[PDB]
Design an enzyme around this catalytic site. Sequence first.
Site, PDB file in Angstrom:
ATOM      1  N   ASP B 335       0.856  -1.168   0.000  1.00 53.48           N
ATOM      2  CA  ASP B 335       0.000   0.000   0.000  1.00 53.48           C
ATOM      3  C   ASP B 335       0.907   1.237   0.000  1.00 53.48           C
ATOM      4  O   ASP B 335       1.743   1.387  -0.908  1.00 53.48           O
ATOM      5  CB  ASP B 335      -0.968  -0.091   1.186  1.00 53.48           C
ATOM      6  CG  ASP B 335      -1.948   1.048   1.239  1.00 53.48           C
ATOM      7  OD1 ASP B 335      -1.738   1.966   2.061  1.00 53.48           O
ATOM      8  OD2 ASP B 335      -2.925   1.029   0.476  1.00 53.48           O
ATOM      9  N   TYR B 466      -1.580  11.100   2.820  1.00 51.89           N
ATOM     10  CA  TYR B 466      -2.405  11.455   1.680  1.00 51.89           C
ATOM     11  C   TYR B 466      -2.465  12.959   1.407  1.00 51.89           C
ATOM     12  O   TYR B 466      -3.147  13.387   0.476  1.00 51.89           O
ATOM     13  CB  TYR B 466      -3.841  11.018   1.923  1.00 51.89           C
ATOM     14  CG  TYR B 466      -4.121   9.541   2.085  1.00 51.89           C
ATOM     15  CD1 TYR B 466      -4.518   8.762   0.998  1.00 51.89           C
ATOM     16  CD2 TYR B 466      -4.084   8.945   3.340  1.00 51.89           C
ATOM     17  CE1 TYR B 466      -4.830   7.419   1.157  1.00 51.89           C
ATOM     18  CE2 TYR B 466      -4.390   7.607   3.507  1.00 51.89           C
ATOM     19  CZ  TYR B 466      -4.760   6.844   2.420  1.00 51.89           C
ATOM     20  OH  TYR B 466      -5.066   5.516   2.611  1.00 51.89           O
ATOM     21  N   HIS B 524      -7.264  -6.634  -0.439  1.00 47.38           N
ATOM     22  CA  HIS B 524      -6.304  -5.557  -0.294  1.00 47.38           C
ATOM     23  C   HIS B 524      -5.285  -5.796   0.800  1.00 47.38           C
ATOM     24  O   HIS B 524      -4.169  -5.277   0.747  1.00 47.38           O
ATOM     25  CB  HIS B 524      -7.025  -4.243  -0.044  1.00 47.38           C
ATOM     26  CG  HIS B 524      -6.090  -3.123   0.291  1.00 47.38           C
ATOM     27  ND1 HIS B 524      -5.279  -2.577  -0.624  1.00 47.38           N
ATOM     28  CD2 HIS B 524      -5.795  -2.504   1.507  1.00 47.38           C
ATOM     29  CE1 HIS B 524      -4.533  -1.628  -0.038  1.00 47.38           C
ATOM     30  NE2 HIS B 524      -4.848  -1.592   1.270  1.00 47.38           N
TER      31      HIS B 524
HETATM   32  C1  LIG Z   1     -13.876  -1.323  -0.822  1.00 38.73           C
HETATM   33  C2  LIG Z   1     -12.784  -0.615  -0.055  1.00 38.73           C
HETATM   34  C3  LIG Z   1     -11.700  -1.354   0.423  1.00 38.73           C
HETATM   35  C4  LIG Z   1     -10.662  -0.752   1.139  1.00 38.73           C
HETATM   36  C5  LIG Z   1      -9.531  -1.627   1.619  1.00 38.73           C
HETATM   37  C6  LIG Z   1     -10.687   0.728   1.405  1.00 38.73           C
HETATM   38  S1  LIG Z   1      -9.493   1.451   2.244  1.00 38.73           S
HETATM   39  O1  LIG Z   1      -9.452   0.809   3.532  1.00 38.73           O
HETATM   40  O2  LIG Z   1      -9.819   2.839   2.471  1.00 38.73           O
HETATM   41  N1  LIG Z   1      -8.056   1.380   1.646  1.00 38.73           N
HETATM   42  C7  LIG Z   1      -6.955   1.798   2.528  1.00 38.73           C
HETATM   43  C8  LIG Z   1      -5.667   2.072   1.744  1.00 38.73           C
HETATM   44  C9  LIG Z   1      -5.961   2.703   0.389  1.00 38.73           C
HETATM   45  C10 LIG Z   1      -4.746   3.394  -0.245  1.00 38.73           C
HETATM   46  O3  LIG Z   1      -4.343   4.378   0.334  1.00 38.73           O
HETATM   47  N2  LIG Z   1      -4.190   2.974  -1.409  1.00 38.73           N
HETATM   48  C11 LIG Z   1      -3.131   3.625  -2.227  1.00 38.73           C
HETATM   49  C12 LIG Z   1      -2.012   4.355  -1.478  1.00 38.73           C
HETATM   50  C13 LIG Z   1      -0.695   4.292  -2.262  1.00 38.73           C
HETATM   51  C14 LIG Z   1      -0.535   5.332  -3.377  1.00 38.73           C
HETATM   52  C15 LIG Z   1      -1.555   5.133  -4.483  1.00 38.73           C
HETATM   53  C16 LIG Z   1      -2.920   5.619  -3.997  1.00 38.73           C
HETATM   54  C17 LIG Z   1      -3.785   4.575  -3.252  1.00 38.73           C
HETATM   55  C18 LIG Z   1      -6.615   1.582  -0.427  1.00 38.73           C
HETATM   56  C19 LIG Z   1      -7.802   0.893   0.272  1.00 38.73           C
HETATM   57  C20 LIG Z   1     -11.893   1.463   0.870  1.00 38.73           C
HETATM   58  C21 LIG Z   1     -12.105   2.947   1.045  1.00 38.73           C
HETATM   59  C22 LIG Z   1     -12.873   0.762   0.165  1.00 38.73           C
END
Ligand SMILES: Cc1cc(C)c(S(=O)(=O)N2CCC(C(=O)NC3CCCCCC3)CC2)c(C)c1
Lengths: 548, 548
Positions: B335, B466, B524
């Site tokens: 992540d 973020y 995830h």
């Molecule tokens: C369906 C669903 C599942 C999950 C795991 C989340 S979440 O918990 O908020 N989540 C936490 C971490 C998030 C995340 O920050 N991912 C990446 C960060 C690295 C740089 C590229 C941008 C995105 C990705 C998913 C959410 C909001 C929705």
Amino acid sequence: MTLRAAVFDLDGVLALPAVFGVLGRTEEALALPRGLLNDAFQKGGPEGATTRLMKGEITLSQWIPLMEENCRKCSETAKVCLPKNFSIKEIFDKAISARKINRPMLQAALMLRKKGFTTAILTNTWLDDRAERDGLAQLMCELKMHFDFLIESCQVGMVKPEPQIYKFLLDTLKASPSEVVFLDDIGANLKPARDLGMVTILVQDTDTALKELEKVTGIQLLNTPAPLPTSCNPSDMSHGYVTVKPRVRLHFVELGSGPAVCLCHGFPESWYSWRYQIPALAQAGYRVLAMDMKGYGESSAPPEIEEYCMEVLCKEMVTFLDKLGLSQAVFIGHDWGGMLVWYMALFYPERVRAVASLNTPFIPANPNMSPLESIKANPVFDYQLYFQEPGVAEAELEQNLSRTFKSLFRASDESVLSMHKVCEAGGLFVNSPEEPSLSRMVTEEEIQFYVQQFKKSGFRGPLNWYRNMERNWKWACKSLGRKILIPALMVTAEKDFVLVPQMSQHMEDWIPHLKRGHIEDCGHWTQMDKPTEVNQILIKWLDSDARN
Amino acid sequence: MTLRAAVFDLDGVLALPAVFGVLGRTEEALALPRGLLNDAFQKGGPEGATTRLMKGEITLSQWIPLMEENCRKCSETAKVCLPKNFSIKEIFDKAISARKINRPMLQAALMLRKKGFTTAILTNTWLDDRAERDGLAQLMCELKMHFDFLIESCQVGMVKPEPQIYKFLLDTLKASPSEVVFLDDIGANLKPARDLGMVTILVQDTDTALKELEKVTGIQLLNTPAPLPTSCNPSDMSHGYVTVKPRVRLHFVELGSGPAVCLCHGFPESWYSWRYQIPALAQAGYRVLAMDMKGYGESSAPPEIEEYCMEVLCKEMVTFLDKLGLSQAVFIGHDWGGMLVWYMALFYPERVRAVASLNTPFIPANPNMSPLESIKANPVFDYQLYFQEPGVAEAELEQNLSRTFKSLFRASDESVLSMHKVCEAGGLFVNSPEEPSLSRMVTEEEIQFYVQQFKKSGFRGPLNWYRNMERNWKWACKSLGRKILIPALMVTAEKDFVLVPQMSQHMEDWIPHLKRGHIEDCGHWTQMDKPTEVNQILIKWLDSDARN
Ligand SMILES: Cc1cc(C)c(S(=O)(=O)N2CCC(C(=O)NC3CCCCCC3)CC2)c(C)c1
Ligand SMILES: Cc1cc(C)c(S(=O)(=O)N2CCC(C(=O)NC3CCCCCC3)CC2)c(C)c1
Ligand SMILES: [Mg+2]
Ligand SMILES: [Mg+2]
């Protein structure tokens, strides 16, 4: 001017065989047109492959083939043809690893820092992504801990004759141009320093450069005495903590990679007693684990006496390895730590890669005589009888922590403590000074570090190591049929008048392959007394016996 | 009876190719009289060389030549002569290293412990001082962490058919004879267990032994499903702490020796998110450094946003290596940790032995478009817009820490959170349950560990990762001309519906030698979702690419 800052070029100043000195040698070796390799290297000028490399726009492995190109195009218009297996990669690998720290220049940088100067490295260098990049990484690592700042061209996106980089230098230093010296092997890099008003030094031979830096700074740099090894700042170390038992947590300081070397201090000391060896052994390729032994510093100090018999001390050190995921470690100990380390060899040889003790010999238990008599047999061990009665030694040692450590930590010719007839006089300090002078071996700051540590648990725990003579004896008697046949080193100190060298004289009867070391003019506090020779002896023995 | 304790023999039960099975094979191989090697091994009985060895009176290297002797005297009175280069040392080296953990037996021991049993190993073994002793040390290490007690004959001075050792066993276990099962490959070792009233099992083939242990214990042991890898108990780990800056201390958990592997968790996680890989990679020959990244757990969490831009995050990780004395480490991240780890490869390749990311792809900054628009381009990144305004996401996530983590940490088919239109609904949990069910992936205890950690600093620090989109973008743009040419692995998770596998599809344009891995049915939270396959993928890649 009045200088308070020194800046050093790397290649050619802090690091020798300059890499242009391989560019040059190679031309001759292969009988290429003079300067062909250097033409190809500077092709394009400010917007050429090399400047892009130095500014961090491209990596070194990206640059190699661009440079091969330029060696071709210079080899076209200069009217020749390159040798059949010409490899720019190979030429630079050799050059890069051939380069080493220029020790006198580093010493001069050290000295200046020691006397209040802000120091920095300013270097045109590259993002190194070669398979063999760890070499240079190591070098840069050793250097950077000794300076306030390392400014790399490829990190700041600016390069070194560009005035902007000197503006960045000045801003990083918080200094006016005339407050700083700058040494570089290239003339063009100095001109801009001059225009802002900086003192500058063209570095050709190291010795002359230092002579100029001596004159301009007014501090003796050349021909100054052999300096102590690198020490440790406690607050810059990695501190580690392992629970070995419900109520017992062990603390240690950790530095370096490679085979695990576990250092075990004596009484009444500290992980900090290894301050002179932690950096040296890390640099020599080892992972140093410098303990606060049980009873000291940030390790737990439970009050019960039997929590400090050698058997529970050793088991706990095994658990320490267990929880850290270490199948083995090299065990090096001093004084009490030395005793324990032999017993780790005798009772847990599978966990001990190798064993070394400073001062403390291995004498087997006499299965007939009681040790509480053996200790009366030698007048110089009288102080151990004074340690037996819980409470008495604690009150004396804890009432003036500074006095205690200033009085103890002294070289062989600075003695203020008559070891004989301590029970009689009724105290280790009875006729010793209230405000002792500071030994040659320790600064006021260093002493106060010990004072700080002993304010946590004081002396109960530490003194308890002496309060299991009978229990340790019974335990040790189980080993009377064994021998130590793992790799082992004994280091005697000439002028340790209690753990005297002659006590070690029969050790090869039980340790037949024992290797030895001996240190002249060295008292009981071997590490802080003769750090250079200790580091030299251990590193030699580590590389020959704890390795391959 | 009603059992609450299981005791396992080592050689022949927990460890296979039993070493008597090399004694035997060697006789045949060399056409020696049947049992000659076994005669020499047991010569003298209770007061013979072997019993003295097993009782810890002598070491294994002391014993070798006594056994050679006995091979001579048995070879005299049995009327033969030994082959010219006969080496007892060589026969045992092969035997000892040929021996491995009997995995089904260890699994059965695990299961029993998991269901409340006290477990112990009772073994006749030796103080091992051979040059090649680390092999067996490792084995014993892996085994002992899974049991309450390891009782070695040479440690307790008693041996195994002697009734006294079973009295010691019973006392160590705090159990009545009829409360314990004892499995051993030798009949004579069981008779005494029987006389006190212990259940016993002659262990010939592993499967049948387990069948008996199934019947006698009433718990399914054989044919039970593939079990999770070893996890970590936080309070048994070595905890480490490094100050990287005046106000910033980084904490990590450390296990194993060999090349440094630095694990970097994502949002909103913890060193503990690597609980399933820390043991596995240590066991595979690595020194794992599992971070609390800045903002989390026991690492400092300064409130300023810019303390969390990728550039200061990366520099701090370099300082972390600096202070630890590490020239390089292998960097594996998930992540957010994954993003950082790519940027460590791009900006500090000399310090990165190798780089691996789970889920997070490397996409370069678009130097024209702003990222705050790119993030509006994809509906599934809407939640990142909700994270921008300091305070709003904090209040929601911090008001019920248990609810937050139960809701987040779920497998792909257990979703309770619609990632799209989070700004619209006005909260990540707007229409989600107040008391969520526990996922398959996490016990109540494991969740509460996260709850405990986030009570220190909460979510400001973590959310700030973020809040530097523009700053990270500007920084990243400096790398647009580079490539990653160090060793690199990308691991995609099929059913990560936000960091989807297709986002990775162009990565080889900038990482030409990129190696891949893919995990089916994985959401995830890759590590706690498919720990077995993650461990398998990383260890494979570590050994082929981060090593030799
Ligand atoms: C369906 C669903 C599942 C999950 C795991 C989340 S979440 O918990 O908020 N989540 C936490 C971490 C998030 C995340 O920050 N991912 C990446 C960060 C690295 C740089 C590229 C941008 C995105 C990705 C998913 C959410 C909001 C929705
Ligand atoms: C002249 C003099 C010098 C010194 C360094 C001391 S001392 O500070 O008390 N001192 C502290 C440590 C002490 C010591 O405990 N030495 C060893 C311990 C290992 C087992 C074998 C028994 C003896 C040896 C010397 C004393 C009492 C007198
Ligand atoms: Mg230079
Ligand atoms: Mg057996």
